[PDB]
């Protein structure tokens, strides 16, 4: 019944050729970025005062050691796979690993690898498995990887043990920032002419946190099913932005409103009526 | 291969009031591969000391970035976001409009 924040650890490793390469990483707890990992750096940087959770300094340091060795070894393995399998540069690899905790001391995890922007393999249970639409050569690579007991045990226990203990330390240490509520502000605007006799009404909503929001154009309590909400766009201070438009004939605009619902308003919706 | 062209969205943090201080945002998203060149422009000239988010990616693996700078809107100043990518024949510019 308490809120659920999954931890997803992202990695971007790029290989322009046999010599030039860089690997960068970051980690997210729900919508918040807790960590950053730059190729120029030797450590994973913590972005929030509570990023280390309830981990000891020595526990955080052995993780820093695993990531140091993993980054070096990831790079050398890619270069050696490309030479053996005759792959063509440039190569781009992405990893998406992490877990989410549940009530009942259960937990599910994932570790997905992508090549040129498409899934090729993942870690399932105890070993590596290829995806259905994985190129033929990926099967030669899975074979070599699954011979590496040490790495398989290490990935297994990172996902099934380390990751869930870590996120639970983040959930209490960052309890307060995760429950924080920031009220949005909304304003009205007119957009470029959609048609000859038509108007584009624009509703701007900015500065809300957390991410879940509800914004629709209304005529009283009848929702206007023609509302086009955009993407939820980020602000530099980690609140969000939304623009919600409606195409209507000139005369029907009168009597329409833009309604905003958000956890921060405690039922007190923002309702702005058309000029 | 399958390369994805970037989507560019330009917006301000607060309702633009001429002469008041504001933040100018450019969210660049849905592109692949990751190498990208993003600039914010003041009357076609590049702005310096502009900050950006750590490069990240969505479930479908396309990348996204947020570039932003503090700025003061006026009646005649034109702001834009200029992006170049492998998928683009020329650098693409998206002007800012308070709508």
């Amino acid at each position: 019944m308490q809120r659920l924040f999954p931890l997803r650890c992202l990695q971007i490793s790029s290989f322009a050729n046999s010599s030039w390469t860089r690997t960068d990483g970051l980690a997210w707890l729900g919508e918040l970025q807790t960590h950053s990992w730059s190729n120029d750096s030797d450590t994973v940087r913590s972005l929030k005062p509570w990023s280390q959770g309830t981990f000891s300094d020595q526990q955080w340091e052995t993780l820093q050691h695993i990531f140091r060795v993993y980054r070096s070894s990831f790079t050398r393995d890619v270069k050696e796979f490309a030479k053996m399998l005759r792959l063509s540069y440039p190569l781009e690899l992405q990893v998406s690993a992490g877990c989410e905790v549940h009530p009942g001391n259960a937990s599910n995890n994932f570790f997905h690898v992508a090549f040129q922007g498409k899934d090729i393999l993942s870690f399932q249970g105890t070993s590596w498995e290829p995806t259905q639409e994985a190129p033929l050569w990926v099967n030669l690579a899975i074979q070599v990887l699954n011979q590496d007991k040490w790495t398989r045990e290490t990935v297994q226990w990172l996902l099934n043990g380390t990751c869930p203990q870590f996120v639970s330390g983040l959930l209490e240490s960052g309890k307060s920032e995760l429950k924080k509520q920031v009220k949005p502000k909304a304003w009205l605007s007119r957009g470029p002419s959609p048609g000859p006799g038509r108007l584009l009404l624009v509703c701007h909503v900015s500065g809300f946190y957390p991410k879940p929001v509800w914004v629709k154009w209304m005529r009283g309590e009848q929702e206007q099913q023609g509302t086009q909400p955009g993407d939820i766009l980020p602000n530099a201070d980690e609140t969000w932005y939304l623009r919600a438009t409606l195409d209507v004939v000139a005369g029907e605009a009168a009597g329409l409103s833009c309604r905003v619902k958000h956890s921060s308003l405690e039922g007190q919706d923002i309702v702005l009526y058309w000029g | 291969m399958i390369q994805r062209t970037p989507k560019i969205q330009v917006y301000s943090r607060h309702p633009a009031e001429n002469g008041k201080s504001n933040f100018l945002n450019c969210y660049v998203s849905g592109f692949h591969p990751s190498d990208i060149e993003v600039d914010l422009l003041k009357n076609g000239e590049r702005i310096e000391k502009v900050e950006h988010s750590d490069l990240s990616f969505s479930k479908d693996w396309s990348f996204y970035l947020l570039y932003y700078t503090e700025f003061t809107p006026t009646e005649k100043d034109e702001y834009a976001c200029r992006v170049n990518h492998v998928t683009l024949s020329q650098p693409k510019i998206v002007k800012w409009d308070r709508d």
Epitope: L85, L87, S88, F115, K118, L136, W137, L140 | -
Partner: nanobody, 117 residues
Framework: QVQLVESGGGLVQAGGSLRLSCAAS????????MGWYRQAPGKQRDFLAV???????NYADSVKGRFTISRDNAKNTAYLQMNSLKVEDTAVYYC????????????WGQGTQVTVS
């Protein structure tokens, strides 16, 4: 161009053997890895076996032990010797190649039918 042509399919009794072949056209340098998939009626195409120019192989667990993949680099052709066939092996068997310069997708053959009665 790349051209993969299969042969060796047919119809055989349960317990029998069959040997499929795949002739590729191009250099020995332009084909990197060769392999086999199969698709039963109304199901997905499943990976079966792969072999590199150096001779390294990988087999899917369903067939590990019954099928063996082989390669003749002089004629740039791959073989799949199928032994101890079961009825569940009835499918279209497709040839696949990893062609130099194309790492994101396979090159495919038109397939050859294998029916086991």
């Amino acid at each position: 161009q790349v051209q993969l042509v299969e042969s060796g399919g047919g119809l055989v009794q349960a317990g029998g053997s069959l040997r499929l072949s795949c002739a590729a056209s191009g250099s020995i340098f332009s084909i990197n890895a060769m392999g086999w998939y199969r698709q039963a009626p109304g199901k997905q195409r499943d990976f079966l076996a792969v072999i590199s120019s150096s001779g390294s192989t990988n087999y899917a667990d369903s067939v590990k032990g019954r099928f063996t993949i082989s390669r003749d680099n002089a004629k740039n052709t791959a073989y799949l010797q199928m032994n101890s066939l079961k009825v569940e092996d009835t499918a279209v068997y497709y040839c696949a190649a990893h062609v130099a310069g194309f790492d994101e997708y396979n090159y495919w053959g038109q397939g050859t039918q294998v029916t086991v009665s």
